[PDB]
Ligand binder design. Structure first.
Ligand SMILES: Nc1ncnc2c1ncn2[C@@H]1O[C@@H]2COP(=O)(O)O[C@H]2[C@H]1O
Ligand SMILES: Nc1ncnc2c1ncn2[C@@H]1O[C@@H]2COP(=O)(O)O[C@H]2[C@H]1O
Lengths: 127, 128
């Protein structure tokens, strides 16, 4: 008996965008392509209106995100670090390294995201 | 044709302690019992004194460790990330994410560890 990872059907554009977002991320870019494929398939969609706090610094984290549409701002202790648009990963640090969120992430406009949780991610790492 | 993995004889007591540390690990929980047993068999003992740097961030990582005794401190560019005590695994990230060491690991007291090299660990993961 092995657990079946949930599959979320996606458009090819979406799959390409997720794959390129991972390959753009310094910390995830070296994962096997086969693992990236499984991450792509397991990611599920989530949506936020503007001025939404997706991630609060210091919280425990469960999800890594890929941005499909929109723009976020990353701040730490009130200080703007950057902004991110489509094709970018965020919220990966807590999941990769098992720490609390290292920064806060808010939406500047509406956003569409893809998300995958640690548990699913770690299973994929072990295959 | 097929690599024979090293076997390191160990007391039953040590096998148990290593098995527990592995079963306590997020990633390692995913493995089959038999793979976990094979990891236990491939591990070999290594010790470090107080104030040793076992793992330096940015290096190539070819070893995964279980800590039997002792306490260790994890840093990144000088900044304390956390500490880890007995029964914990460390050094698995470089292997699992296929990258250089993501943090620096220094001993806070004398430690006693078990180590498995990357070849064995990956071989065992492949052999489901
Ligand atoms: N200095 C930075 N520059 C760009 N993004 C950052 C920076 N610091 C933190 N982040 C992002 O903000 C996220 C907050 O949650 P995480 O710590 O899980 O992962 C973090 C990164 O994705
Ligand atoms: N918060 C952390 N960030 C990065 N590595 C950590 C952290 N906490 C513990 N570690 C361990 O530090 C190890 C350093 O080598 P690795 O990157 O191979 O594997 C890493 C983890 O096992």
């Amino acid at each position: 008996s092995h657990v079946t990872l949930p599959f979320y059907p996606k458009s090819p554009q979406s799959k390409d965008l997720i794959k390129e977002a991972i390959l753009d991320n310094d910390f995830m870019k070296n994962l096997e392509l086969s693992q990236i494929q499984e991450i792509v398939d397991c990611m599920y969609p989530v949506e936020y209106g503007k001025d939404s706090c997706i991630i609060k610094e210091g919280d425990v984290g469960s999800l890594v995100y890929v941005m499909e549409d929109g723009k976020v701002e990353v701040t730490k202790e009130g200080v703007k670090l950057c902004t991110m648009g489509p094709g970018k990963v965020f919220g990966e640090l807590a999941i990769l390294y098992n720490c609390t969120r290292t920064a806060t992430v808010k939406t500047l406009v509406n956003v569409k995201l893809w998300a995958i949780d640690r548990q699913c991610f770690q299973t994929i790492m072990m295959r």
